[PDB]
Amino acid sequence: SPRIVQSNDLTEAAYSLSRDQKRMLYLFVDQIRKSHDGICEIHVAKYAEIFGLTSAEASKDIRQALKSFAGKEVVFYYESFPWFIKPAHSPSRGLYSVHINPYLIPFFIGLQNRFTQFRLSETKEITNPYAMRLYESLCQYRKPDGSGIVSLKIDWIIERYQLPQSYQRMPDFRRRFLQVCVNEINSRTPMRLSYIEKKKGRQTTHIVFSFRDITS
DNA sequence: ATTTTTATA
């Protein structure tokens, strides 16, 4: 299963992509690392096989994700970059060509430290894109035995994962982000994950996540 | 393929 590797600056970046858009980005990163000008491709049949879909559903997912990439940017901590520099197109039936911004390529190759790595198998069943964001941030601090302890500030999560307004007040945050995403990770990944809310007096300031691998 | 990073267990 392919190893997704990226700069920690990307794991921490402010962006908002759908689940399917992040699935495609995983494949783009693998292509970039295994090949720069940024031009990548996606075969519907291969996507369907990787993610366990019919070609019909894969084509629908891919077409919607590629269309919705229009105008999407990533913000590094600011500096903002478009993900794509041309619309995706289809040279052959079942095949799509994309041009990832060449300025984003250094976030995926030539990394010698401060990088995040995980296997595609770890994330390919996640359905919630904010749970994917959280999973990657946990992988960023994962120890060689598969465990880790990660403290994230709540205002940082809101800003970098670009949570909608309906997520940001602490009842909603706890319910819409924390509970759903942690339970999604526990259900659909090899990570076993718990958390504690830390409070500065009255205000809940950060979340301390503790995790282990199901491989124990 | 690799490594440095948070605040903390």
Swiss-Prot record:
Top-level taxon: Bacteria
SUPFAM superfamilies per record: Winged helix' DNA-binding domain
UniProtKB keywords: DNA replication, DNA-binding, Plasmid, Plasmid copy control
Cross-referenced InterPro entries: Initiator_Rep_WH1, WH-like_DNA-bd_sf, WH_DNA-bd_sf
Record-linked Pfam families: Rep3_C, Rep3_N
DNA-binding found in the keyword field: yes
Name of this protein: Replication initiation protein
Species the sequence originates in: Escherichia coli (strain K12)
This protein's encoding gene: repE
